[PDB]
Amino acid sequence: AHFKEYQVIGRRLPTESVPEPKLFRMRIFASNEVIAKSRYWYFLQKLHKVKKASGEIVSINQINEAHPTKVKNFGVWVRYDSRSGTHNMYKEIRDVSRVAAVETLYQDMAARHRARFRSIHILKVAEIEKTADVKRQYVKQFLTKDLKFPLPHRVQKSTKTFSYKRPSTFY
Amino acid sequence: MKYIQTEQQIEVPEGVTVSIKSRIVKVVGPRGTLTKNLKHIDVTFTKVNNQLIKVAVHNGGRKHVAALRTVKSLVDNMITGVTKGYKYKMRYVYAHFPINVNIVEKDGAKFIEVRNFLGDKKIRNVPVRDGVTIEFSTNVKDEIVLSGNSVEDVSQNAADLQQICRVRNKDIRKFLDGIYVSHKGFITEDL
Amino acid sequence: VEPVVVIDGKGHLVGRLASVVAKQLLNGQKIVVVRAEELNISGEFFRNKLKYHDFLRKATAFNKTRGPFHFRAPSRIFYKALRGMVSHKTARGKAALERLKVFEGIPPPYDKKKRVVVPQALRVLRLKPGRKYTTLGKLSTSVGWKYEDVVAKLEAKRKVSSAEYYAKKRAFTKKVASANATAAESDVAKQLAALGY
Amino acid sequence: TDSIVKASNWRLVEVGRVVLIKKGQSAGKLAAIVEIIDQKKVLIDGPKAGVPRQAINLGQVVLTPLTFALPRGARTATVSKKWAAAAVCEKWAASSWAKKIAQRERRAALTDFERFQVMVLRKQKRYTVKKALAKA
Amino acid sequence: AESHRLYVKGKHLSYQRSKRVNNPNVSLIKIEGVATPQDAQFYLGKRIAYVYRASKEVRGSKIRVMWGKVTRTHGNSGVVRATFRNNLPAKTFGASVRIFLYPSNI
RNA sequence: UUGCUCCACACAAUAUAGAUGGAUACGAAUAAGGCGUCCUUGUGGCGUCGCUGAACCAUAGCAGGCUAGCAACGGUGCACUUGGCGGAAAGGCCUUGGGUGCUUGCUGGCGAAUUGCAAUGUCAUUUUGCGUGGGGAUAAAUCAUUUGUAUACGACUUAGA
């Protein structure tokens, strides 16, 4: 859905042999807190020997974008499962926020590789602070000086079923 | 990857004049005039300084930006054809039977006739598109020159003349006879 | 809103126009469709020709006279596409189909009438620029329609007459524009402009 | 003679281009394209009209023929300053487009007595223009 | 004048139905002009008359009326649901019908 | 045994796939156009418009009465009337002239009630019949007989004041 970013901090259950566990933290893009905690436990089960029964979640907090109205470029490292194997990818996206960047990434992966949310693992998303470190053409294209382009062939959808003049696609 | 802007440039020499309404291009030069319909290609034109014209495509795919360079080459071929002209030199190739090529007038339409191609009794008659002038050139044996402004008309007429003299039911590696285009150039080369 | 709606089928898509007209007829609007020889089908001409040949190959084996009739005219092709979308085997479907007339060209009852368009079935508004399409008149005369040139001649004559009409209409409306331009800027004109007219 | 090419210019999208928000919460206000995010969406701001600074798909706005000077990524204070300096509000209002919209909403806001009044005034103006349309 | 209409024209589209089962107790009415339920909410509770003619005069008139009312909106395009005292005869699919401005809330 | 057709209105019957202000006429392109203006008339220059018909026209009066006047010399209906044009299914479009009626372009006078607090509250067009009174025209086909270029029978092809 429309994604929200959370930090999920959890730990193992405290024992007398070892109190104060090490308080692992993840950043999860999910639609709500339930899916956030689910993906947190899923990744912690893949990384460490812990599960939801043996652990607890000490905090979950929504991370809003610091500047939600600045246009950023994000480099996103992704692991996804194809029909034959597992692959790593690096895609870079020009977008205004991290949640919308991963949203259009999920749409792009589902469109170009038929990869689903159950297959895509977000390794990381990091904002490229300096241009000319962008290496993909489709986003390097929008970084030229005095950028401008037209919008040819305007289609204005009508509310009536019949029109009384031939419509024009001028702009 | 949806290139938001690609463009080529065409140079317009001094003697020529280019008139482009919607996508109908008309070039007028010393050798005459030429026209072309391009309403199937979906590009845009822009005159800069009456001697340079940019042709552009926006938000175009791979095939679209390929066709933009194609139409640039088409319009500058028209320009160089109305300035310099186009001249295709073809040779007759035979082993034993001398090919007898003349010009007849059926309905007054300037037909090219080919007799004795490999000694057959069939007379092959290929028509001549307008704007193409044919001269059987002296000082070179077995040589015919097709000249004109339209490279399309000249080259397609030469291809028709070549394809009408194809050998059937024989090894074409041994029976190399026919009428083949040897040279393509301009009427005013090294101008 | 109108008793009869006259649709100029030029530059329209066959299936989208048919699905519009079918629902309009079933709702009870009388529709006449003219210039069915200028309809468009998405897809390249050879592709649609192969489609029509595969339809044309189908026939009742023991008697071709009772088979699916393969009509060749563009109006009848549009009518077939529309009868596919109307439940024509009932009285309601028959009554709906009697509210529909299709013509090639524009016949003299309707050449003096106002022709409308359907913007959600127009090729320039629906097809991506670059996609190939075909013309229904060209397909019909390729597959056996015999009357493509006579409708071209009749439409040329009709266009001459209609341009000779539009010249006078344009002269009269520029006269009207001059008249109400001089009769603007009055008290009543300023009051109407204040009131929104 | 000289070569002629029909230019066919139309309403480039760039920074400083004024757009009319077609649909949404604003739905008829003006904004200015602050940045171009991608081929289809832009970061706009309409701070004088009360439009929040936001990213938006270009199918939700209509581009006006107006354009004023802006650096890319300008914040809303600079946008408001340059907007008031270039004075694009009354320049938009002087156009026939905004006049058509104002005429539409005025006709929508007319009451029945006002409809009767415009009927009578239209009859009077019809009489005088039809009297005028007999001497030429 | 030349106009005397104090109602809105509408069309009797169909009954309430599934893909294969109808329900003649509820009719669907397309009011002309309206294209959304937000505008169709103005017409809820308004009286509807289907006015038809017969050859036999009953009580001074060869014109017979079936009365009903608007109940709710149907869909996203301004179609409304209507109920009648006796249901509509189903030969009037596509027939015109009159939606009166009373009972008014203006 | 005075039949048939057309025209006028007079009364009946018959229905309605569904009036309830107006189907309101260029063509072409859409990575282009429309309109206005100007010139050296073009694939011309300049200006302007679109971003919906939410338009334009019509629209006040007893379901639209009876009257008076002012201003213009228009607008519109009806019945004529002149001249055209239209053959794709033309059966319609335009125009001349006069007559007659209305005019809400403007100012006045009188009337409406009681259908009782709503009840489509009835005003359309489709066909047929019967009467009047005014024109207009006064046939064929079939069976039977016959033919044989035809034929199971029908049918077909012929002939017969």
SS (H, E, C) chain A: CCCEEEEEEEEECCCCCCCCCCCEEEEEEECCHHHHHHHHHHHHHHHCCCCCCCEEEEEEEECCCCCCCCCEEEEEEEEEECCCCEEEEEEEEEECCHHHHHHHHHHHHHHHCCCCCCCCEEEEEEECCCCCCCCCHHHHHHHCCCCCECCCCCCCCCCCCCECCCCCCCC
C81-112 in b/e form (b: 16+ CB < 10 A) is bbbebbeeeeebbeebbebbbbbbbbeeebbe
E strand or H helix that includes residue C75: helix C74-83
Instruction: Give dist(CA A166, CA B137) in Å, integer.
Output: 57
Query: ∠ CA E76-E79-E83 to the nearest 5 degrees?
Result: 135
Which among C116, C124, C129 has CB closest to A163?
C116
Across all strands, nucleotide nearest D5 (CA–C1'): F43
Scanning every residue of chain C, which has its alpha carbon at the shortest distance from the alpha carbon of B41? C130
Joined together, the tokens standing for residue E90 give 């189903």
E strand or H helix that includes residue D78: helix D76-86
Q: How near does any CA of chain C get to the CA of A151, in Å?
A: 13
β pairing state of C100-102 and C40-42: unpaired
Residues 35-74 of D with CB under 7 A from strand F: 62
Task: Give chain C's count of helices (H) and strands (E).
Answer: 8, 5
Instruction: Give dist(CA E28, CA E98) in Å, integer.
Output: 13
| Three-state DSSP state, D45 | strand
E8-20 in b/e form (b: 16+ CB < 10 A) is bebbbbbbeeeee
The count of residues in chain B is 191
Query: What part of A 26-55 touches C (C-beta under 8 Å)?
Result: none
B18 C-beta less than 7 Å away from strand F: no
β pairing state of A55-62 and A4-12: antiparallel
Instruction: Give dist(CA D64, CA A149) in Å, integer.
Output: 15
| Three-state DSSP state, C29 | coil
Q: In what order do the strands lie in the sheet with B178-185?
A: B133-136, B143-148, B86-93, B178-185
Other C-beta atoms lying within 10 Å of the C-beta of residue A116: 12
Which among C116, C125, C129 has CB closest to A162?
C116
E15 C-beta less than 7 Å away from strand F: no
Q: Do E and C make contact, counting contact as 3+ CB pairs within 8 angstroms?
A: yes
Scanning every residue of chain A, which has its alpha carbon at the shortest distance from the alpha carbon of D41? A95
Scanning every residue of chain C, which has its alpha carbon at the shortest distance from the alpha carbon of E90? C92
| Three-state DSSP state, C178 | helix
Query: ∠ CA A9-A10-A16 to the nearest 5 degrees?
Result: 140
Q: Tell me the CA–C1' distance in angstroms for E61 and F159.
A: 66
Query: What part of B 40-99 touches D (C-beta under 8 Å)?
Result: 44-47, 50-51, 53, 59
Residues 41-60 of B with CB under 7 A from strand F: 42-45, 56-60
Scanning every residue of chain C, which has its alpha carbon at the shortest distance from the alpha carbon of A163? C117
**Neighbors of chain D with 3 or more C-beta pairs under 8 Å:** A, B, C
Contacts made by residues B169-178, CB under 8 angstroms, sequence distance 24+: B175/B95, B175/B118, B176/B93, B176/B95, B177/B93, B177/B94, B177/B95, B177/B97, B177/B99, B177/B117, B177/B118, B178/B92, B178/B93, B178/B117
Q: DSSP secondary structure string, C57-69? A: T---SS-GGGS--
Could you tell me the CA-to-CA distances from D16 to D40, D67, D73 in Å, in that order? Answer: 17, 6, 10
For strand F, which nucleotides have at least one atom less than 7 Å from a protein CB?
13-21, 23-33, 35-37, 43-45, 48-61, 63-64, 72-75, 86-93, 104-106, 119-124
Other C-beta atoms lying within 10 Å of the C-beta of residue D40: 13
Residues 20-59 of C with CB under 7 A from strand F: 28, 30, 32, 38
Scanning every residue of chain C, which has its alpha carbon at the shortest distance from the alpha carbon of E14? C27
| Three-state DSSP state, B183 | strand
Structure solved using which method?
A: cryo-EM
**Is the Cβ–Cβ distance between C43 and C16 less than 8 Å?**
no
Contacts made by residues A76-79, CB under 8 angstroms, sequence distance 24+: A76/A101, A76/A102, A76/A105, A76/A122, A76/A124, A76/A125, A76/A126, A77/A123, A77/A124, A77/A125, A78/A105, A78/A109, A78/A120, A78/A121, A78/A122, A78/A123, A79/A120, A79/A121, A79/A123
E strand or H helix that includes residue D61: strand D61-67
Instruction: Give dist(CA B71, CA B25) in Å, integer.
Output: 11
Q: Tell me the CA–C1' distance in angstroms for C169 and F84.
A: 20
Q: How near does any CA of chain D get to the CA of B189, in Å?
A: 25
E35 C-beta less than 7 Å away from strand F: no
Q: Which residues pair with B9 in a beta bridge?
A: B54
Instruction: Give dist(CA B136, CA B113) in Å, integer.
Output: 13
Residue C114 DSSP symbol:
P
Instruction: Estimate to the nearest angstrom the gap between the alpha carbon of C8 and the chain centroid.
Output: 3
Instruction: Give dist(CA A149, CA A94) in Å, integer.
Output: 17
How large is the C-alpha radius of gyration of chain C? Answer: 22
| Three-state DSSP state, B100 | strand
- A138–B contact, CB cutoff 8 A: yes
B188 C-beta less than 7 Å away from strand F: no
Q: Tell me the CA–C1' distance in angstroms for C178 and F49.
A: 17
Other C-beta atoms lying within 10 Å of the C-beta of residue D2: 10
Q: Which residues pair with A88 in a beta bridge?
A: A79
The count of residues in chain E is 106
- What are residue C23's phi and psi, to 5 degrees? -65, -35
Instruction: Give dist(CA C12, CA C117) in Å, integer.
Output: 8
**Is the Cβ–Cβ distance between A63 and A27 less than 8 Å?**
yes
Mutate to test the interface with B, among A145, A149, A169 (most CBs of B within 10 A): A149
**Is the Cβ–Cβ distance between C19 and C85 less than 8 Å?**
yes
**Is the Cβ–Cβ distance between A7 and A21 less than 8 Å?**
no
Chain D interface residues (partner A, CB cutoff 8 A): 10-14, 35-39, 43, 53-55, 58, 63, 73
Q: For residue A169, which residues of chain C lie inside 8 Å, CB to CB?
A: 124-125
Q: In what order do the strands lie in the sheet with D61-67?
A: D51-57, D41-46, D30-36, D17-21, D61-67
The owner of tokens 């005292």 is: E85
Q: How near does any CA of chain C get to the CA of B21, in Å?
A: 19
Q: Which residues pair with C122 in a beta bridge?
A: C12
Any residues with CB less than 8 A from the CB of C108 and at least 6 apart, and which?
A: none
The owner of tokens 């003697």 is: B15
Domains in chain B, start-ordered, CATH in brackets? 1-85 (3.90.930.12), 86-191 (3.90.930.12)
Instruction: Give dist(CA C108, CA C111) in Å, integer.
Output: 5
- CB–CB of C119 and A153 under 8 A? no
Q: DSSP secondary structure string, E16-39? A: EE-SS-EEEEEEEEEETT--SHHH
Query: ∠ CA C72-C78-C81 to the nearest 5 degrees?
Result: 105
Instruction: Estimate to the nearest angstrom the gap between the alpha carbon of D49 and the chain centroid.
Output: 12
| Three-state DSSP state, B21 | strand
How large is the C-alpha radius of gyration of chain A? Answer: 22
B&D contacts, CB < 8 Å: 33
Residues 71-130 of C with CB under 7 A from strand F: 91-92, 95, 98-99, 103-115, 119, 124, 129
Instruction: Give dist(CA B110, CA B129) in Å, integer.
Output: 9
Q: For residue A153, which residues of chain C lie inside 8 Å, CB to CB?
A: 124, 129
Q: Which residue is nearest to nucleotide F121 (CA to C1')?
A: E61
**Neighbors of chain B with 3 or more C-beta pairs under 8 Å:** A, C, D
| Three-state DSSP state, D56 | strand
Q: For residue A141, which residues of chain B lie inside 8 Å, CB to CB?
A: 3-4
Q: Tell me the CA–C1' distance in angstroms for A167 and F38.
A: 30
Q: For residue C7, which residues of chain A lie inside 8 Å, CB to CB?
A: 162
- D14–C contact, CB cutoff 8 A: no
The owner of tokens 């693992």 is: A121
| Three-state DSSP state, E83 | strand
Any residues with CB less than 8 A from the CB of E32 and at least 6 apart, and which?
A: C1, E8, E9, E10, E11
Q: Which residues pair with A30 in a beta bridge?
A: A4
D66-94 in b/e form (b: 16+ CB < 10 A) is bbbebebebebeebbebbeebebbeebee
E53 C-beta less than 7 Å away from strand F: yes
Q: Which of B97, B119, B93 is nearest to B172 (CA)?
A: B93
Other C-beta atoms lying within 10 Å of the C-beta of residue B13: 13
Could you tell me the CA-to-CA distances from B12 to B32, B38, B68, B77 in Å, in that order? Answer: 15, 19, 17, 12
